Design a protein around this ligand. Structure first.
Ligand SMILES: Cc1cc2nc3c(=O)[nH]c(=O)nc-3n(C[C@H](O)[C@H](O)[C@H](O)COP(=O)(O)OP(=O)(O)OC[C@H]3O[C@@H](n4cnc5c(N)ncnc54)[C@H](O)[C@@H]3O)c2cc1C
Ligand SMILES: Cc1cc2nc3c(=O)[nH]c(=O)nc-3n(C[C@H](O)[C@H](O)[C@H](O)COP(=O)(O)OP(=O)(O)OC[C@H]3O[C@@H](n4cnc5c(N)ncnc54)[C@H](O)[C@@H]3O)c2cc1C
Ligand code: NA
Lengths: 335, 335
């Protein structure tokens, strides 16, 4: 059974790992990707576990997000959780209005509304939440997934796939399409578009909480947020639909710094370390489904797993579990 | 009006500040001087991680603690918060059995019980709390107070005071005794005793919460605790009555490290940065009262402000205000 996983981001590596630990013994797993850690969108993410506020169009995604939290919760107190870049963090979600509770309110730990004395610390906001969640930094998690894969016999190849057929010609029986925001290059998807994001990494070691603000009229993550990592603090708040510019933007740089300093004036004493741009694979819902390749002399099974938007880290494991369930359905039908 | 404050820890400097801001105008001149054998970072105040949390049990002590928190909380987003060494932090208080709520439950931010899913992360404990408090790092706060004092004309002097009388003979009208655990060298106090504590400073920046454990089998502050500072994380849990050893010892280092690693297994990847020993000024209650000096030819009143145990940072401001009131009493009896 010969399988090719395209994509070395959090989605491709976790799917390759998750499929391997369920369906090996003898599985031939190969990972094709043209960029690896540190040069993926997964490495640009702060890694805060938090799905979108509104309910997902696919209610299964709330299940996938809950399965990812429980899986990461089973790692947090293991002695090597820092090798995963995983740790607990509590923080604030700030609003100008009483947004309804999110679907993940019982998934995170200790979800509650903010008290007036807490809201008095943020004069520009009149409502919000407090809860405890997790951070999973891509740079560490992708490296962890890699050696978990390599020590299992999984081989990696740096190469740009031009088409599913080219891989099908080489004899792949299953193609796992985990190409993120670039899935349209292999199969047109007018529902897939980039959510361009720019972030800033600063040295602010006194920041122990995440702080996320929301103006839903401006769009999700078009409002300042502050997310402490393991080494530095991530400043952000830019979500640009349809923008493919990978270069850092000067107005976006000012927008991040302005907004975050207004939110947390202590950041005026912070040292800027770096600045990065990434593309969220935006889709009305995640494409997680099986598909027959209707092109070429062979019918090759494709498991799609892309379009995770701004919550790929948040949801990757449940999606990997679902893709593994589809792989098994293929393995049974092929007999 | 000559005043000599003995001690440059949090009690002496805050008392000297409170006395000046309250009686500077009505007394021209008000000559305040601070005598101290040692200054930050060589005071007991500098060994403390600086977490605000009073004892778990004199009912004025609850008020002085709450006054301190409200005064510190009003500075959280101020431009000087980094100069003060102040920042917010949430964390866990863990118990082996159910315990009633503390008196200060409404002073901190978002106090609540731990949920079953949270308590599952700490198998050694079946009950606990979660809330948001403050850390005031003495290494910064003592420098901040010193600067506020010097700009108000308060002069500092490095000297070991041998007796109250030596300072009285030099013309001091009021002596504020803020000598902490060493107050007994100036006047025998069989109620004051050293509470020796050894701590560990480690580089574990993924730790965003404090964790305090409570073990009646081991004693108060003799159970592991984890308190993240700005640059390092304090590992502690040592309370030894009557031990005057100022050196770190290996057995106490092991007790802390093993205890904290059992509580938080990720610490096995932390770099130990440093290790300090301090002596809590243990007393059944704070000595905060006036006394006429019955030694030497001079008419000098002593204001005692010592014996704050393991909560001096937590309570320092309320005590400083009360000491300023006692100073006002002395002024009223001089007329
Ligand atoms: C600024 C920003 C902040 C974010 N913060 C968070 C956060 O806090 N929490 C969260 O959960 N999510 C967050 N996200 C979202 C998260 O980054 C993504 O949802 C997630 O990384 C998507 O993973 P992926 O593997 O599908 O995409 P990618 O990580 O981009 O992986 C795509 C992979 O496919 C490969 N590939 C693509 N096309 C081809 C081809 N033709 N041939 C070969 N290889 C190919 C690429 O080389 C790459 O290895 C953030 C995103 C941005 C932009
Ligand atoms: C390990 C540890 C952890 C702690 N953690 C916390 C915590 O998280 N939160 C909290 O609120 N509290 C904490 N504490 C308690 C806190 O450190 C003390 O209660 C507080 O620092 C006492 O303040 P002080 O100014 O009286 O003593 P000090 O800070 O020791 O100041 C005494 C001063 O008097 C001077 N002095 C003494 N004798 C003389 C003399 N004869 N002549 C001249 N100068 C003299 C000294 O040189 C020094 O300047 C902790 C204590 C320890 C040991
Ligand atoms: Na438990």
């Amino acid at each position: 059974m010969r399988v090719v996983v395209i994509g070395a981001g959090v989605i491709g590596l976790s799917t390759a790992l998750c499929i391997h630990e369920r369906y090996h013994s003898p599985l031939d797993i190969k990972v094709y990707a043209d960029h690896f850690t540190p040069l993926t969108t997964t490495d640009v993410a702060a890694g805060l576990w938090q799905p979108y506020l509104s309910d997902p169009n696919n209610p299964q995604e709330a299940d996938w997000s809950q399965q990812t939290f429980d899986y990461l919760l089973s790692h947090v107190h293991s002695p090597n959780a820092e090798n995963l870049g995983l740790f607990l963090i509590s923080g604030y979600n700030l609003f100008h209005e009483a947004i309804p509770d999110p679907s993940w309110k019982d998934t995170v730990l200790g979800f509650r509304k903010l008290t007036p004395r807490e809201l008095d610390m943020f004069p520009d906001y009149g409502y919000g939440w407090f809860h405890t969640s997790l951070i999973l930094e891509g740079k560490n998690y992708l490296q962890w997934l890699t050696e978990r894969l390599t020590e299992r016999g999984v081989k990696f190849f740096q190469r740009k796939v031009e088409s599913f057929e080219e891989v099908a010609r080489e004899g792949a029986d299953v193609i796992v399409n985990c190409t993120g925001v670039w899935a349209g290059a292999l199969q047109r998807d007018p529902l897939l578009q980039p959510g361009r994001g720019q972030i800033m990494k600063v040295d602010a070691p006194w920041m122990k909480h995440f702080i996320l603000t929301h103006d839903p009229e401006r769009g999700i993550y078009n409002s300042p947020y502050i997310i402490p990592g393991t080494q530095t603090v991530t400043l952000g708040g830019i979500f640009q639909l349809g923008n493919w510019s990978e270069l850092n933007n000067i107005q976006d740089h000012n927008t991040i710094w302005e907004g975050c300093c207004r939110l947390e004036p202590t950041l005026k004493n912070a040292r800027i370390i770096g600045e990065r741009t990434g593309f969220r694979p935006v889709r009305p819902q995640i494409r997680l489904e099986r598909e027959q390749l209707r092109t070429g002399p062979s019918n090759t099974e494709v498991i799609h797993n892309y379009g995770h938007g701004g919550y790929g880290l948040t949801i990757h494991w449940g999606c990997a579990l679902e893709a593994a369930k589809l792989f098994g359905r293929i393995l049974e039908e092929k007999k």
